Amino acid sequence: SHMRILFLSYRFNSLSARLYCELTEREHEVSVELDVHPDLTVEAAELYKPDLIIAPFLKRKIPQEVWKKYKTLIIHPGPPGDRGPNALDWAIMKGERIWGVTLLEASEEYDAGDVWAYRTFPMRFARKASIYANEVTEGVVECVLEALENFERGDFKPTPQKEHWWNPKMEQELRRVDWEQDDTKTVLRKVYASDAAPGASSKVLGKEVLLFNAYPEEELKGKPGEVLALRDEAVCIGTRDGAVWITHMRERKKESIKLPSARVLGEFLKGVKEDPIKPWEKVDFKTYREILYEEEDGIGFIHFNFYAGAMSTEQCYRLLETIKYAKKRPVKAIVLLGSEDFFSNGMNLNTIENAESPADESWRNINAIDDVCEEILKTPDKLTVAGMQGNAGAGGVFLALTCDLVFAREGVVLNPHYKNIGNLYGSEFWTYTLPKRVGWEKGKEVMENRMPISSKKAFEIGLIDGVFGKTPKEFRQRLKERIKNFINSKDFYEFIEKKKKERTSGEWLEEIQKCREHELEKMKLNFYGFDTSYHIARYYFVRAKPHFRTPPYLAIHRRLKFSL
């Protein structure tokens, strides 16, 4: 059973990429056609002639002549019988305690098809994007693998829907945050239901904005809608009964992009006081903590919750400060944990796109990331560990590889390449870390591959040191257990005595410095050379510019020497 499967996807988003990994790593073939026009979707089915069509992420209705000719399965982010385009938004706005995902056949009426598989799960009070990236994606993977088994046996009959309900597209009026009428929990619900799209509309300091990435505040209080403090470019705003932090906003203009709240609001904030909290401080009330540092059992853990996994120049320097602090503590190991949803995705393209000179900000950002990487590498007397709870890509993958040990949760998706951002050369000392892990030949193959790999595949090829745990929490618990065991063994003290010798030698230090210099000269060419392929790719990505065809690297049915 080696099937030829066609994905229909609005964008090749995280769910599409997770399912791509699960299917191709089982030796099925997956071709992708992006959702551009029904005529293109029809042409792609006729060109590729799939065994099976899966639609992980649909915008347009599938043309009748496709799904009447090829078995076509649709992913719906709600339990059986739920119908409509904003299933998750409604489930969060309504406060459902149980939700689910359904794999169902295409049909004439919207979301009416017979059910092939479904999974249910308890709801978290959390951002829509986090539900989609964790509970929904894990459930969808189980549905799809189950349906491939059913499909190959050949006598499967799906289950028609009995009871069902329809929720229309959710309107902004329902999402809009009113600082006077809404208590903190209501603000949270509205932002969570709208994050990472379309955002919850609001007014702040006179500006019509969309709100993203909210956190409750318990100490600071004031008048509803008053800005009470600034902290790492997040703003804290009074609610009816309290206060809420908003880390990111987007103005409601055509050209505008999602940015840290301080950069959107700008001069309007003049006079607000920064309310700093160091990551290593203990607080016993709820508040916004971008970076958290905690010690347990001789291990120092650094959580860094950078929105979208994107690390701006300033977030890099804040992370560096915390690594430096940790390296002065009496810990045996330092563990970089990122956030539950992302380890890191590299440079912050939005803050780069927003800068007066994108090229100068790119140069600032890559040097900031490399300063973090350098500090990690030059840690002679402690174990360094990257714990990837969530996806990673571009410079974020190579940040992890500077750690002595790299572990990832099961189901993490990796993009260890730059082919989506204008073929950047990359830095982060990859010319040192990558061949030490896979060899030069395979390392070059890894960075030429534009398609994603799973953390299981990354472990099998030697790119990372282990993969375990189904959820972020389970992964953190097994990670701590495994590190705790190592640092309490004789093997750890032998290892540190060797590392102390290697990482203080002049030879090793000149080696890593030469790798940084050579990488940065290439990135300098990328950022400033006459070829501006990097800037062009960044513009299309940050601005979400639409596609007018499916590139051949996605569409196998549209490659030059394609036949049969």
Numbering used by the authors: -1 to 562
Paper text:
CO produced by HypX is used as a ligand of the iron in the NiFe(CN)2(CO) center of NiFe hydrogenases.
Further mutations on Ser194, Gln195, and Asn306, which interact with 3’-phosphate group of CoA, resulted in a decrease of CoA binding affinity. The Q15A-R131A-S194A-Q195A-N306A-R542A variant showed two MS peaks due to apo (CoA-free) and holo (CoA-bound) form in native MS analysis while only holo form was observed in wild-type. Thus, a loss of hydrogen bonds with 3’-phosphate group of CoA decreases CoA binding affinity of HypX and these hydrogen bonds play an important role for tethering CoA in the cavity.
